[PDB]
Amino acid sequence: GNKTGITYPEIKLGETGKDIKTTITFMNNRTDMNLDTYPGKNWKSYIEDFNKMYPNITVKVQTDSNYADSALTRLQANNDSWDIMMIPAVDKSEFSNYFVPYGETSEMEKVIKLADEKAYDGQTYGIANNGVTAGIVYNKKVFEEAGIKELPKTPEEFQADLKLIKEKTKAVPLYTNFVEDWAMGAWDQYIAGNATGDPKFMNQVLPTTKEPFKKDASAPDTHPYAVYKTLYDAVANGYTEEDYSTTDWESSKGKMNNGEIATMVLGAWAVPQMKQAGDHPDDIGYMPFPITVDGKQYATIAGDYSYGINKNISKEKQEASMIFVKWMTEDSGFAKNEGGIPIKADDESMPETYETFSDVELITDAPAKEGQEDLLANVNSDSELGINNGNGKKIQDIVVDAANRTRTIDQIMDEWNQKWAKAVEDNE
Numbered sequence: 001g002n003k004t005g006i007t008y009p010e011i012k013l014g015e016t017g018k019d020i021k022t023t024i025t026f027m028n029n030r031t032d033m034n035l036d037t038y039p040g041k042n043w044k045s046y047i048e049d050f051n052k053m054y055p056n057i058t059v060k061v062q063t064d065s066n067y068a069d070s071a072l073t074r075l076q077a078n079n080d081s082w083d084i085m086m087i088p089a090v091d092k093s094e095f096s097n098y099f100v101p102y103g104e105t106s107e108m109e110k111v112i113k114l115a116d117e118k119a120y121d122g123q124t125y126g127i128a129n130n131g132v133t134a135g136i137v138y139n140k141k142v143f144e145e146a147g148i149k150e151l152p153k154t155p156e157e158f159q160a161d162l163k164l165i166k167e168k169t170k171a172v173p174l175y176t177n178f179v180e181d182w183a184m185g186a187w188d189q190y191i192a193g194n195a196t197g198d199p200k201f202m203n204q205v206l207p208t209t210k211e212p213f214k215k216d217a218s219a220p221d222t223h224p225y226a227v228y229k230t231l232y233d234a235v236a237n238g239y240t241e242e243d244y245s246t247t248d249w250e251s252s253k254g255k256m257n258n259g260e261i262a263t264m265v266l267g268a269w270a271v272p273q274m275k276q277a278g279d280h281p282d283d284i285g286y287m288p289f290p291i292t293v294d295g296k297q298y299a300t301i302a303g304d305y306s307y308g309i310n311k312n313i314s315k316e317k318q319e320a321s322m323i324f325v326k327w328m329t330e331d332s333g334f335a336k337n338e339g340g341i342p343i344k345a346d347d348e349s350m351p352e353t354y355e356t357f358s359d360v361e362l363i364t365d366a367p368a369k370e371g372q373e374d375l376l377a378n379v380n381s382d383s384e385l386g387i388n389n390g391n392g393k394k395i396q397d398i399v400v401d402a403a404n405r406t407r408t409i410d411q412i413m414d415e416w417n418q419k420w421a422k423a424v425e426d427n428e
């Protein structure tokens with residue numbers, strides 16, 4: 001797919017491509033950063049900084065509120081109307097049908113983190129925008145008002161804390177952001193490394209296990225079941241917003257900052273957005289998801305959204321785009337600014353958000369065994385469950401079922417297991 005003859009490690013920022021005069025279109029999900037009133041460093045500011053180094057590469061930013069859906073639509077049009085996008089929910093095995101390979105994955109791992117996350121048949125097709133963990137954003141002042149002494153570490157402790165918040169404060173204990181598909185889909189981010197302690201769970205165990213959503217007999221407070229039951233119980237116990245059908249994401253930021261919401265299950269990228277949303281940044285904290293595995297808590301570090309380059313575009317625009325991605329990765333400061341972990345391989349600096357995480361084991365998803373790279377994507381597709389790959393609708397169903405008492409969490413998990421179990425069988 002690479003028309004340029006140049007791999008990503010071969011780019012010398014400030015020297016390579018300096019003769020290029022072109023314009024590239026950069027599609028991303030950060031509508032907030034596409035505004036002049038963004039409380040932080042917005043897209044225009046980054047592009048200005050980039051243009052000091054490459055003045056003749058003009059970068060045009062396009063942002064969509066319904067990002068996942070609109071990016072996939074543009075991808076399936078198979079044209080040259082975009083040059084860089086954040087990779088949406090695409091089968092790894094289909095990367096080469098859409099995206100320029102940055103380079104051999106073994107070479108990329110020398111210069112970026114998470115080089116095998118968006119890779120296939122030995123090539124890397126996406127670079128993460130920053131490394132994030134999945135945890136819980138919480139308001140420390142609301143927790144103090146509720147009398148919560150220590151952060152909850154099990155589902156039972158969490159529900160006990162939500163009840164204290166409900167009874168003793170005025171905050172919504174857990175705000176679901178039901179209306180945002182991506183906010184509901186985020187619950188899939190906790191069910192593997194966080195809920196099991198096993199870096200191989202996501203890419204090896206899950207797609208080879210017929211009923212992964214069943215309760216774990218030995219440790220019923222762990223594994224994916226415990227995650228989805230956390231959401232189920234919080235809604236069924238009356239510890240979420242009165243009306244899930246009318247939640248609002250943008251106002252939820254200000255409400256967290258001002259102590260009207262106590263918790264939201266979101267990745268670390270959300271911490272600066274909550275802190276910027278009002279006068280009480282110091283009241284925003286970040287905690288591990290409340291599962292303990294054999295006495296230890298775990299948090300997976302993963303890419304939030306990865307940059308991919310359109311294989312359909314000219315060699316000039318492919319190279320211009322790869323220069324901008326490398327600039328974003330190595331020079332921009334995006335990760336330092338959005339509260340995430342830098343992706344340049346040799347940068348071991350960490351957001352200050354990781355201070356309730358001193359005893360947490362930070363892990364990354366191991367690749368599948370050789371030849372199984374595509375197994376999760378294929379079981380996911382055939383099951384129609386879209387685990388960690390776009391499907392927030394099934395999580396909305398958890399909220400609906402728990403609020404209307406139509407089904408128990410067991411029954412919901414049993415439905416998923418039967419669909420997954422067939423997909424595991426069909427792909428073995």
Ligand SMILES: OC[C@H]1O[C@@H](O[C@H]2[C@H](O)[C@H](O)[C@H](O)O[C@@H]2CO)[C@@H](O)[C@@H](O)[C@@H]1O
Pocket residue numbers: 029030031032064065066067182249269273304305
């Ligand atoms: O990239 C982090 C998450 O962004 C989310 O989109 C938000 C965005 O962060 C910002 O808050 C904007 O104001 O609203 C967007 C939703 O329209 C989602 O894309 C999510 O999937 C990302 O993980």
Ligand SMILES: [Zn+2]
Pocket residue numbers: 065066180181
């Ligand atoms: Zn939306």
Ligand SMILES: [Zn+2]
Pocket residue numbers: 066068069181
């Ligand atoms: Zn959608």
Ligand SMILES: [Zn+2]
Pocket residue numbers: 091092093094374377378
């Ligand atoms: Zn596939």
Ligand SMILES: [Zn+2]
Pocket residue numbers: 104106
């Ligand atoms: Zn090689």
Ligand SMILES: [Zn+2]
Pocket residue numbers: 121
């Ligand atoms: Zn192959």
Ligand SMILES: [Zn+2]
Pocket residue numbers: 144
């Ligand atoms: Zn106290």
Ligand SMILES: [Zn+2]
Pocket residue numbers: 148149150151152157160161
């Ligand atoms: Zn407690």
Ligand SMILES: [Zn+2]
Pocket residue numbers: none
């Ligand atoms: Zn009571």
Ligand SMILES: [Zn+2]
Pocket residue numbers: 179180181
């Ligand atoms: Zn929706």
Ligand SMILES: [Zn+2]
Pocket residue numbers: 196216223
């Ligand atoms: Zn297990």
Ligand SMILES: [Zn+2]
Pocket residue numbers: 279
């Ligand atoms: Zn004020």
Ligand SMILES: [Zn+2]
Pocket residue numbers: 141279280282283
């Ligand atoms: Zn305050």
Ligand SMILES: [Zn+2]
Pocket residue numbers: 415
């Ligand atoms: Zn169903």
Ligand SMILES: [Zn+2]
Pocket residue numbers: 425428
């Ligand atoms: Zn079989």
